Amino acid sequence: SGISQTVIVGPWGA
Amino acid sequence: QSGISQTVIVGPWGAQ
Amino acid sequence: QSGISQTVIVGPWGAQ
Amino acid sequence: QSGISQTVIVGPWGA
Amino acid sequence: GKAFDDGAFTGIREINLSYNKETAIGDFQVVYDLNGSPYVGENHKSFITGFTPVKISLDFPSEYIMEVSGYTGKVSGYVVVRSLTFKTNKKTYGPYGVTSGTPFSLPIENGLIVGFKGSIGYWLDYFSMYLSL
Amino acid sequence: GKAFDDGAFTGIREINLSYNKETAIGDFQVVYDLNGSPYVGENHKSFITGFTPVKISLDFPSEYIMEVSGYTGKVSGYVVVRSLTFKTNKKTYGPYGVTSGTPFSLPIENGLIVGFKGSIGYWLDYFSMYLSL
Amino acid sequence: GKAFDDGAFTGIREINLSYNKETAIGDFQVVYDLNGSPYVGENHKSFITGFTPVKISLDFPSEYIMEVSGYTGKVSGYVVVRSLTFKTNKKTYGPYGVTSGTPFSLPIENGLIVGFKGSIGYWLDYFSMYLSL
Amino acid sequence: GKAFDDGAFTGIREINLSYNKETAIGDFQVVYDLNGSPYVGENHKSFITGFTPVKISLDFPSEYIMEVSGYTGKVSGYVVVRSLTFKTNKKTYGPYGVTSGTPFSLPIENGLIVGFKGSIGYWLDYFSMYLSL
Ligand SMILES: CC(=O)N[C@@H]1[C@@H](O[C@@H]2O[C@H](CO)[C@H](O)[C@H](O)[C@H]2O)[C@@H](O)[C@@H](CO)O[C@@H]1O
Ligand SMILES: CC(=O)N[C@@H]1[C@@H](O[C@@H]2O[C@H](CO)[C@H](O)[C@H](O)[C@H]2O)[C@@H](O)[C@@H](CO)O[C@@H]1O
Ligand SMILES: CC(=O)N[C@@H]1[C@@H](O[C@@H]2O[C@H](CO)[C@H](O)[C@H](O)[C@H]2O)[C@@H](O)[C@@H](CO)O[C@@H]1O
Ligand SMILES: CC(=O)N[C@@H]1[C@@H](O[C@@H]2O[C@H](CO)[C@H](O)[C@H](O)[C@H]2O)[C@@H](O)[C@@H](CO)O[C@@H]1O
Numbered sequence: 048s049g050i051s052q053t054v055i056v057g058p059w060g061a
Numbered sequence: 062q063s064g065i066s067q068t069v070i071v072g073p074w075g076a077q
Numbered sequence: 078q079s080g081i082s083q084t085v086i087v088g089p090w091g092a093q
Numbered sequence: 094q095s096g097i098s099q100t101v102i103v104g105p106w107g108a
Numbered sequence: 109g110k111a112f113d114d115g116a117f118t119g120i121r122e123i124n125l126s127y128n129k130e131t132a133i134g135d136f137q138v139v140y141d142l143n144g145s146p147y148v149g150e151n152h153k154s155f156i157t158g159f160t161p162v163k164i165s166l167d168f169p170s171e172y173i174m175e176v177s178g179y180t181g182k183v184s185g186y187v188v189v190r191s192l193t194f195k196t197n198k199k200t201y202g203p204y205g206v207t208s209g210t211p212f213s214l215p216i217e218n219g220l221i222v223g224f225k226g227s228i229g230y231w232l233d234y235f236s237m238y239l240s241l
Numbered sequence: 242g243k244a245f246d247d248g249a250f251t252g253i254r255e256i257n258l259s260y261n262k263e264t265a266i267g268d269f270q271v272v273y274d275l276n277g278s279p280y281v282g283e284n285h286k287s288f289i290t291g292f293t294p295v296k297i298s299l300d301f302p303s304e305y306i307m308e309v310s311g312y313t314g315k316v317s318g319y320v321v322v323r324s325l326t327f328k329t330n331k332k333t334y335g336p337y338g339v340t341s342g343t344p345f346s347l348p349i350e351n352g353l354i355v356g357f358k359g360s361i362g363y364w365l366d367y368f369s370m371y372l373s374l
Numbered sequence: 375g376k377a378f379d380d381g382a383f384t385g386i387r388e389i390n391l392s393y394n395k396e397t398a399i400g401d402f403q404v405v406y407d408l409n410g411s412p413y414v415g416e417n418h419k420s421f422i423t424g425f426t427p428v429k430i431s432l433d434f435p436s437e438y439i440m441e442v443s444g445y446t447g448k449v450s451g452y453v454v455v456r457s458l459t460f461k462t463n464k465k466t467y468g469p470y471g472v473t474s475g476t477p478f479s480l481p482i483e484n485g486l487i488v489g490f491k492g493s494i495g496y497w498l499d500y501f502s503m504y505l506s507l
Numbered sequence: 508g509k510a511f512d513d514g515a516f517t518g519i520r521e522i523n524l525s526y527n528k529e530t531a532i533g534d535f536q537v538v539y540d541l542n543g544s545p546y547v548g549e550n551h552k553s554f555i556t557g558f559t560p561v562k563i564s565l566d567f568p569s570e571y572i573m574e575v576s577g578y579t580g581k582v583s584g585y586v587v588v589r590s591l592t593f594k595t596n597k598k599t600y601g602p603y604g605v606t607s608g609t610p611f612s613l614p615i616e617n618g619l620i621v622g623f624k625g626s627i628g629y630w631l632d633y634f635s636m637y638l639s640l
Contacts, residue, residue, distance in 0.1 A: 049438030050407070051384045051488050051506045053116045053222065054069055054352035054372050057236030059212045060180050060226070061187045064518045064571035065540065066621050066639045068249045068355060069239050070217035072369025074345045075313050076320040076360070077215075080305025081274065082251045082355050082373045084515045084621065084637045085101050085505050086483035090611045091579050091633030092586040092626070096119045096141070096172035098222050098240045100382045101485075101618035101638050104502025105492060106478045107446045107455045108375070115409025118382060142408075143381025143489075211343055217369050236350055239372065241640050248542025249517065275541070276514025276622075374507045478612050483635055502616050505638065 109229025114138060114149045116223045116238045121146050121168045123194060126159030127205040132181075132188040132231035134159035138224055141168055152228045164194055164201045171198045173221050176237065178202075181209025189232040242362025245285045247271060249356045249371045254279050254301040256327060259292030260338040265314075265321040265364035267292035271357055274301055282357075289363045297327055297334045304331045306354050309370065311335075314342020321364040375495025380404060380415045382489045382504045387412050387434045389460060392425035393471035397449050398456040398497035400425035404490055407434055421496050430460055430467045437464045439487050442503065444468075447475020454497040508628025513548045515622045515637045516541050520567040522593065525558030526604035530582050531589040531630035533558035537623055540567055548623075555629045563593055563600045570597045572620050575636065580608020587630040 117140035126135035134154035140147045166172070175195040180187060190209050193202035214237065223238030255272035267287035273280040299305070308328040313320060323342050326335030352372050359368030383406035392401035400420035406413045432438070441461040446453055449472075456475055459468030480503065489504030516539035525534040533553035539546045565571070574594035579586060590604035594614075618638045625634030 049385045049432070049435035049486060050410075051116070051486055052351065052374055054219075054239040054374060055225075055236050055350035056071065056214060056239055056352075056372075057348055057350060058226065058234040059178070059214075059236075059346065059348070060189045060232065060234030064565075064568040064619060065543075066249070066517045066619050067218060067241060069219035069241060069352075069372040070358075070369055071219075071239070071347065071372055072215055072217060073359065073367035074213070074215070074311070074369075075322045075365065075367030077367065079302035080252045080299075080353055081277070081302045082353055082515070083484060083507055084639050085485035085507060085618075086624070086635055086637055087103065087485075087505075087613060088481055088483055088635030089625065089633040090479070090481070090577070090613075090635075091588045091631065093633055094172075094218070094220075096166070096169035096220065098118045098220055098382070099617065099640050100488065101505040101640060102491070102502050102616035103480060103505055103618075103638070104614055104616055105500040106444070106502075106612065106614070107498065107500030108453045108493065113409070116384065143379070212346055214347075219372075239352075246542075251514065276512075476610060478610075480613075485638075505618075 109227040109233045111227045112150065112152050113225035114140070114223050116240065117142055117147060119168060119220060119222060120173060121166055123164035125162045125192065125204060126154070127162065128159050129206050132183045132190045133192055133205055134231060135161070136224070136228060136232055140223070154228060155230050162204050166196065167198060171196050173216070175213065175215040176221065177211070177213040179207055179209040179211055183231060186230070186233065189235065242288070242360045242366050244360045245283070246358035247273070247282045247356050249373065250274060250280060251276050251355065252301055253306060253354060254299055256297040257294065258325065258337065259294045261292050262339065264316050264339065265323045266325055266338050267364060269357070269359070269361065269365055273356070285361050287361055287363055295337050299329065300331065304329045306349070308346065308348045309354070310344065310346040311338070312340055312342040312344050314339070316364060319362070319364070321366055322368060375493040375499040377493045378416065378418045379491035380406070380489050382506070383408050383413060385434060385486055385488060386439060387432055389430040390427070391458065391470060392427045394425050395472065397472065398454045399458055399471050400497055401427070402490070402494065402498060418494050420494055428470055432462065433464060437462050439482070441479065441481045442487065443477065443479035445473055445475045445477055447472070449497060452495070452497070452499070454499055455501060508626045508632045510626045511549065511551045512624035513537060513539070513622050515639065516546060517621065518567055519572065519620060520545050520565055522563040523561070524563070524591065524603060525553065525560045526590070527558050528605065530605065531587045532591060532604050533630060535625070535627065535631055539622070551627050553627055553629060561603055565595065566597065570595050574612065574614040575620070576610065576612045577602070578606055578608040578610050580605070582630060585628065585632070587632055588634055
């Protein structure tokens with residue numbers, strides 16, 4: 048894919 | 062600017 | 078897909 | 094560190 | 109609620125939120141840094157009103173978030189974000205909303221928050237943070 | 242206690258730890274992946290004994306940690322990590338220790354835990370994680 | 375020449391450049407992808423005119439650049455970027471300009487070009503690219 | 508030839524190679540940094556002998572490669588890497604081998620070479636570099 052990835056933390060809540 | 066590669070660090074959880 | 082960490086890879090220079 | 098996100102930069106090519 | 113995803117940016121310039129002590133977080137909007145240019149993120153508004161407005165102005169680029177903390181809890185039968193706190197290398201912003209429910213804390217040793225995503229209905233249902241070096 | 246820092250690796254193959262049902266987490270050791278090969282990390286040991294050992298052997302690379310949660314609390318006048326839980330895309334390992342005090346939670350929507358650092362005295366004082374893509 | 379730095383984005387949607395069959399590359403502009411939306415970058419114009427314009431429209435996000443190659447050489451006593459070729463997983467776009475002087479090539483095995491910086495006087499003096507996972 | 512991949516590390520302490528001033532690059536092996544300690548990477552050997560050895564010992568962490576340049580060309584009907592030059596922030600190492608064929612240049616403005624992969628037959632067939640912040 049041509050979409051740039053980033054580290055994601057979460058979710059917090061529901 | 063040094064020759065040591067870095068990474069994201071999350072924490073610390075506990076005594077602070 | 079896997080629990081193997083990834084890195085930016087540049088090349089190859091040379092054959093293929 | 095600072096508040097600016099960093100990225101790998103390759104180059105420059107030319108002058 | 110309505111899901112949202114601001115995506116990834118160069119950094120954070122300002123956080124805009126709202127809260128009610130009796131409920132939870134109502135508003136969420138971020139002014140990001142984009143390659144040196146401030147970028148006004150989409151306004152993630154509550155479906156309702158009666159919120160106390162908060163503006164978190166950061167001394168970008170020297171001032172950056174070292175910790176995001178807060179509380180989740182049940183408000184009208186929904187598990188939502190009740191309280192938020194933002195700690196920088198300069199000061200502590202918050203707590204904004206009551207410090208009751210389940211605590212959560214994301215301290216940072218290396219890297220930065222570069223973006224937000226989540227859902228807003230009556231209140232902030234959930235959120236996630238984009239982290240980068 | 243004594244600080245430790247394993248540094249950054251390519252992934253996680255195994256977690257070896259020990260706990261006490263009345264106190265906290267004691268010893269902490271990781272078998273890392275280093276470029277498709279196991280790398281035995283150093284064993285971070287408590288200054289005391291009496292802990293129950295646990296081996297979290299993972300089906301690397303198909304199995305990887307998605308969440309790390311636990312509790313922080315006071316034991317003999319010291320704030321320590323009382324309990325840990327590791328949820329992969331395949332199973333929940335834990336809780337191990339004492340499910341009392343302030344909870345904490347690290348869900349990861351994108352990226353991996355590639356290393357640990359922290360401090361151990363009589364018990365695990367604190368810990369941090371290295372995250373990478 | 376006049377330096378530019380578009381900074382970092384989320385990918386590439388379109389490249390607009392101009393060349394002269396006798397000289398080098400003149401104009402350079404990128405329609406970048408930003409968090410799922412197109413983001414029209416600054417037009418980096420040459421100090422002169424008489425250039426042939428070319429639009430490189432990408433089938434984003436399925437189509438992405440795997441290699442950037444070209445030529446650096448001397449035009450009127452200046453080392454400039456004389457030629458440029460954008461190679462995707464679907465098509466080869468080029469060469470654009472004069473394929474004379476010294477070749478350079480950036481093949482990508484993993485990662486993406488997410489930004490451009492450089493300098494433009496009468497011609498493209500030099501350029502760099504931001505690479506991200 | 509025989510393919511190889513050392514994967515990713517924390518930096519580079521030393522590069523040990525061999526060349527024949529008549530043909531190309533032969534043997535290639537790297538001493539990496541892994542979390543502050545040296546890690547002797549596998550020895551990637553040439554099928555043939557008669558190469559001039561070279562030890563490129565880096566003043567790690569303050570000295571790091573800022574550019575890898577060289578030449579690719581035909582040797583006995585095969586396409587190989589004929590010469591290599593390593594430019595650091597303190598010194599210039601090389602060229603080593605034959606400075607004939609097609610030149611290539613990989614300068615770095617931001618980030619580090621953290622690993623190598625390639626192939627060795629009678630000579631270094633090709634090579635790729637792991638880049639990281
Ligand atoms: C009209 C609307 O969008 N409803 C909101 C609620 O949304 C629901 O939230 C639950 C949470 O588990 C679940 O995701 C449902 O799919 C979703 O419709 C909720 O967000 C509340 C509280 O913030 O406000 C609205 O009523
Ligand atoms: C130094 C040592 O081995 N003693 C340990 C204790 O460490 C102390 O921890 C406190 C935390 O509030 C503070 O950081 C002190 O500087 C440090 O010496 C402690 O970790 C306890 C129980 O965990 O016993 C240890 O042996
Ligand atoms: C005023 C100006 O920038 N002139 C342009 C040239 O710029 C010079 O380029 C050399 C090249 O190494 C050097 O960087 C000088 O500092 C710089 O002034 C050059 O860019 C040419 C060719 O494109 O165009 C202008 O004349
Ligand atoms: C045993 C072996 O692989 N032989 C070496 C050659 O390898 C061949 O190279 C071609 C290149 O187009 C292709 O990759 C083949 O699959 C491969 O077998 C070659 O590397 C030479 C020179 O370097 O040495 C050996 O003979």
